[PDB]
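Newbie here. six chains, one complex. Structure please?
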Amino acid sequence: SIELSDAVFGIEPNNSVLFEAINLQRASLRQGTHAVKNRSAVSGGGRKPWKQKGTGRARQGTIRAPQWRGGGIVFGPTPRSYAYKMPKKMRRLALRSALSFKVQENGLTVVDAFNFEAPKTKEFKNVLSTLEQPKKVLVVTENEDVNVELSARNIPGVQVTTAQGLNVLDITNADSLVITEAAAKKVEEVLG
Amino acid sequence: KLHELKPAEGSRKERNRVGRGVATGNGKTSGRGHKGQKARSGGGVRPGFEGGQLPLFRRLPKRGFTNINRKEYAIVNLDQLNKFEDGTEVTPALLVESGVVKNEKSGIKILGNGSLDKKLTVKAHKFSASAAEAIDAKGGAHEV
Amino acid sequence: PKMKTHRGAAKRVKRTASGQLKRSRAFTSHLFANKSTKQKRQLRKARLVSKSDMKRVKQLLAYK
RNA sequence: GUAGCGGCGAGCGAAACGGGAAGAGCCCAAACCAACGUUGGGGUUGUAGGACACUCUAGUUACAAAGGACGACAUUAGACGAAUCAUCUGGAAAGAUGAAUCAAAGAAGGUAAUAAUCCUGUAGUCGAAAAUGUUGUCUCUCUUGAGUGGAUCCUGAGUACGACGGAGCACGUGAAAUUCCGUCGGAAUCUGGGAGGACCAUCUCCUAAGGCUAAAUACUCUCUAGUGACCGAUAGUGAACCAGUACCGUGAGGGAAAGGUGAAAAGCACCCCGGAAGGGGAGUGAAAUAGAACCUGAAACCGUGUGCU
RNA sequence: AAGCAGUAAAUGUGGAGCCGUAGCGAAAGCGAGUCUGAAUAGGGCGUUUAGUAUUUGGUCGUAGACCCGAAACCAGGUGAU
RNA sequence: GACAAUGGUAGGAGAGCGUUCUAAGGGCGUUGAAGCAUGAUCGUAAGGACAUGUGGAGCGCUUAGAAGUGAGAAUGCCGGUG
């Protein structure tokens, strides 16, 4: 019926940038919030256990040294961040490649608008069964559809995103893609 | 697919860990040697020098000074002006927009390196002797 | 943090086009009656930092 | 990590411009006016303001003046809230084989084992005697709104500034401007005074020597609700056990080790050896070498019997 | 880049800023040529005139910087049972 | 196929084994998981399986990512036992 420009959904995927984007998104979801205690942080251990020489024993300075039991940890984990950035032109390629990979395997179908009047999970289950969709599916909307979002949010393997906020991880994770024509046009226009 | 991920070939390398047995090659001394200043934890000498004889940057004299009122000009060559079509006006307001001058420091200076082969009019702060005739050789005029 | 630059070295050399360093000459401060005429003429021409010394003080001048 | 400072060595190290968050400005001393130096009015500045003479009309209780009365949300207890039945193994079913249902509820915890439909819950909605916060619509308490002329007068004094000895400005007295302290000298009054990195002249900008002011900023002993490619009993707070406890020192002070029966105590009625501890039966339990010195139970080390020597 | 929006979410906006496209000279300054020099006469440095953003690995600098070990110094307190 | 090379301290370069956690996919388990003991098994090495006893509830496999990632010595620290 309708035809989309081949700049999107019609290009050879680039696996290097896709892998880099997937790694970037996975690393940006990670918070450290991990720490240990070094020699100075542990309580006590100011004096010297015994004199330097005079008895037959190893020379020691504190009771909180790493070789002791209960002393501080040297070179442990420290709180930090793992996020990093990538040039803007390379982010656009990482999304078009994912969409093209989705469309090559016949995993993109276009439907009309969702005129839901009440949030009903059973109705969404039936319409999914009619469309013959797999267990994992991603559906986009032109804006935030409150009625569509309230439903389909308790069925395992079903997630909803907007036209603007398309993710790289979500497209790769999903098994099938269902898009409305208005949202498809918005994606074709706004996205390069 | 999230369960078959392959990074680009030749783009990842495993790091090196020292002090992990003798079969690795960096087991006991961890690539340091035996019984020196450089074999201790805390470094060696300063990057310049430490102790010893006089450093090189101590046996040479200082030269010159710097000017507080120094002016620097952004240079545009004749060959870079071939982008604009013939018989058009060129202004410092247009060179910046067209992408020729990214940073106008104190003005625009036209240097005659290349060949014009055009019929355009250009105005700028300063002109070189070579760039003056080349603009007027094939026609046109320049204004300061 | 940011790496600091040897201020004393920045007052004695200048960077050339190909990344080399241009330096001045020594032994020209005083005591000019103990040197030949040919010596003093040839001590007024600038030189270049040798490759042996370059390997040692390359990190000192990194913002220059 | 630029300009600079620096036994110009080690090293120290800026600001203006530009892009953003946030963003309201006012009150006093003097000239003048009437009492007995006092209290009221007037007046606050650089495109120079005001007193004086001239025709001259938004309560801001976070500064700008200080005490109270008017209904809506939010905390400090809670209440409703959809959906499952069979067979096999087993001590026990939530597991497997089959057939159903709910979902704005497939977060989590507990149930004799691994549960969307067994329980406490979750999504959603409702509920407040009484106390405490925020807010907004009337009360209440103050309130003189505009420009031309400049005779004369007022606009912060032991102050600004200088010398001597110090300190601080990125700047080590150096050609050191800009600003603070101690000692000693010590100015001018809009044709006035200060600054533009010694200093002088010309231009430009500003108006010290009196006092208040929310927001963007920094931090967590605590109160509620959450998360982690953080630890899992030599680890994680020193402390998962009634730990700053035992214990050590005259004192300031130092500072530990110790978690686990089983689903349910159902914690062995009764018989035999003793003085007792302990053991052998019987019994409870799926299991008692799971018997409270109790989940598994490695090594060092200590004993008994055996094939070859 | 900071900031704004967004789930502490990875994505849009944000062009102050930075690097490169042209060097030489202490500087005024000149410019594919500049400095020295009376004089490209010679000589020095340039005319390669393709970089730039992110990231894996190697090394260096500032931070304790591969780990354990002093005789000592300074500051504030406790002691004449 | 034909030839040539392969002793090694300091040190430089490359390919690999194993442990803990995470994402995705796919599996095992009261008809018995991890752990523990034995065996006459497999690969060029670090190492990997299978069977039998004990054990009573969790654990591997593939591709990627991260690191508190490997122990015989320091008159090392703590506990047990000669």
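Moderator note: Residues 19, 22-23, 26-27, 30, 34, 36, 56-60, 63, 65-71, 73, 75-77, 82, 169, 172-173 of chain A lie near RNA strand F (CB under 10 Å from a C1'). Strands of chain A lie at 108-111, 137-141, 158-162, 176-180. Thread marked as resolved.
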